[model samples]
Target: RKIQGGSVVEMQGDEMTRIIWELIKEKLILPYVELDLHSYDLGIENRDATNDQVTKDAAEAIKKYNVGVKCATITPDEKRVEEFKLKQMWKSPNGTIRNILGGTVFREAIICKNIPRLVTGWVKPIIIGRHAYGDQYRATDFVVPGPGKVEITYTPKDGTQKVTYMVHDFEEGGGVAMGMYNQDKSIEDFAHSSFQMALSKGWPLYLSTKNTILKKYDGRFKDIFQEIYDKKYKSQFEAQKICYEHRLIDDMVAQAMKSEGGFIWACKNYDGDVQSDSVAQGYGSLGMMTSVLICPDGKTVEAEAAHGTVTRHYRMYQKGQETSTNPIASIFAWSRGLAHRAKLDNNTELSFFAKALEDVCIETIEAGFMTKDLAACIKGLPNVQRSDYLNTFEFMDKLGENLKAKLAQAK
Candidate 1:
């Protein structure tokens, strides 16, 4: 099937990030490629006005189309509730989208030569697959003021089947107790998604869990992934010269620290939350981190920048002050999604277009056009100036210009 142009859905959000978001689409996306954009105004007020139904509609559209590129949006907390005068603090749009899509979030770093990473040895990017369901994120927990026994019992919906487990027993003193669980179905989905992603990227897949500590709980994850790999993915993985392995969380971290990178590290809910940050910082800036949601079938995906909306930079730009914001991650979000779409449809031209765009961004930075965060990587804390980098809009324009020139030359 020849891949024709695919749809690009742009979700606009609140604050400073919103301003950069417009510049990104205008200066970076619109010029080179003719995309069918299904835009939803997910700005804070719009979100409230729609009562967040817009987010749900967007996720459904992406799932149907198999590709989406989103901008960072606000997830309201107590302070934001007061600031926005919301009816009530709504849950995160991403959370709603994830629940609707039923996929795992993977974060990948965009490596630039001049960007100084926290882990200096990591030259290539480490992609992290975070299973964002169950475990800590969904644990039922409470602090016990007095000695009390805690038991977790699971009654299967069929009623004839029953399983009981003891989470903790606070027999002696005051403490915290919790019950956590994951359905075998969800674990299987997570394993498939991670393995599929690894295979797609042609990178080894590492499933990391603290199985030694939570023997039964974490071990279940380890076992499911192994079984799935052996039954389905092992041969394909071997054919691709990529391996699938399980590692204890600690050992995985240690191995990641010592290794030369280039692998997908599959992490559970809590581990993913913590380790993705480590990987992001290790690669360079939060500005350099790109996030993607991959479904188990390996057919649907949504890509976005891992960082939140840049409120500070937006505020400065509002005052007519020059702002140096990184568009690399967001730009890559679009390219990666498009590349995957092209791969699915076997469209060489579209795939080449995606690759060209990505290369243009990286080559642009390597050629020394960079933002403050990256400039800090080169020049350190002192003496970084506006001359060191172009403002966000101008840098995006430079990339668009580079992309056009390259595409024209290719023709």
Candidate 2:
């Protein structure tokens, strides 16, 4: 079985996460699989040094390879800008990368038996694909006081025609309003990507929006998705015995809460940001979440851990103090990205390697060895100690050792 592994572009970042990033490669990764690593130092300092061109170049490279496993980098704040003495406050690298790729980001949780979920009945994970381009995240708005009418006018770029929409009417009391919109082309891409992901996972896909309230705005999403499904994906979905449906936002959330998990919920930008956190908390730890960016074409993809670099843990490690940071999601970041690469290449061996690595991580936890975050989940305590779990390095080493044993057994 020839496994055509894609080039691994490692984007290094700042603070506590930067420390664990190296350990992840040193212990868990290098010991098992030999990889062609295209490393880029996207640390705050490096971002400044290159004037952010490096981030753009890295995104382009990932585009070329069609698979990228990124480490969490700092989206600089005022304090970070001062500390790094940056030329200017740069936009988030992830945001920049997503724009260049024109994809939707889906977040899925790594479920473990021991972890306590807010929704206790959800045994499987609910994967969320968020449309990252438009709506609240990118809207033109201004503050309006007193009584005023808000109108959104769409003038055709060619200047052939003009369309105006009365967004809101304030008879007396005042509130804020905004003009937000999404292109038909973008929504079509989002629908295709989401449907493709759902089909790939053998999971039902639910597209949710406030279609009743924002009739024109959200209805466009509902309409586009339906159009795509009816014309392109309906038969394939039925053939697979899977489903693609649209639901009202409130109803969908309620259904998600009460139902046994195992569905992909496709959301708009704002909904994804808010709902993903809700789902993450429901799953018990941000450390256990994995994020994947699926492009509209359903070909290129990027995967990464949902949590930021573990800065506090890194600081502890710097002082020679033991730190118990969870590496499961980060490890899966690489594995999932590789699995996609394997799929693209039709390499069963590489696919098996990715699956085996993921299984090894899960098995290690099931076997009573885990990091502090997981230990806390198992114990459900405010105070967890060194006795409860292994430090970051030790945990990765344990995983590496277990992976070898698992691979031998599989062989």
Please tell me which predicted candidate would have the highest lDDT against the true structure. Answer: 2
What is the per-residue lDDT of model 2 for residues 149-178, given as tens digits with 9 covering 90 to 100? 988797889999999978788899788887
Estimate candidate 2's alpha-carbon lDDT, on a 0 to 1 scale: 0.82
Per-model TM values vs. the true structure = 0.85, 0.85
Model 2 Cα shift for residue 154 (angstroms): 3.9
lDDT at residue 27 of model 1 (Cα atoms): 68
Q: Where does candidate 1 stray beyond 4 Å?
A: 1-4, 136-153, 160-181, 196-203, 233-243, 318-320, 345-349
Worst-scoring 10-residue span by lDDT in model 1? 1-10
* Residue 231 Cα positional deviation in candidate 2, in Å, after optimal superposition: 2.9
Candidate 2 clash figure, as a count:
4
Cα lDDT tens digits for candidate 1, 1-411: 222566766677777667777776676566656766788887877888889889888988887888888888998877888988887777778767776676688887888766777776786668898886666655566778988777778787889988877756777888887777677887899998888888888999999988889898899999999999999998999999989989988899999998888899999877887888788877777788878888765688888888878888877877998888887877778788888778777878888988988899889999998778788777775978767877777787788788879888988
CA-lDDT, candidates in order:
0.81, 0.82
Report the alpha-carbon TM-score of model 2 versus the true structure: 0.85
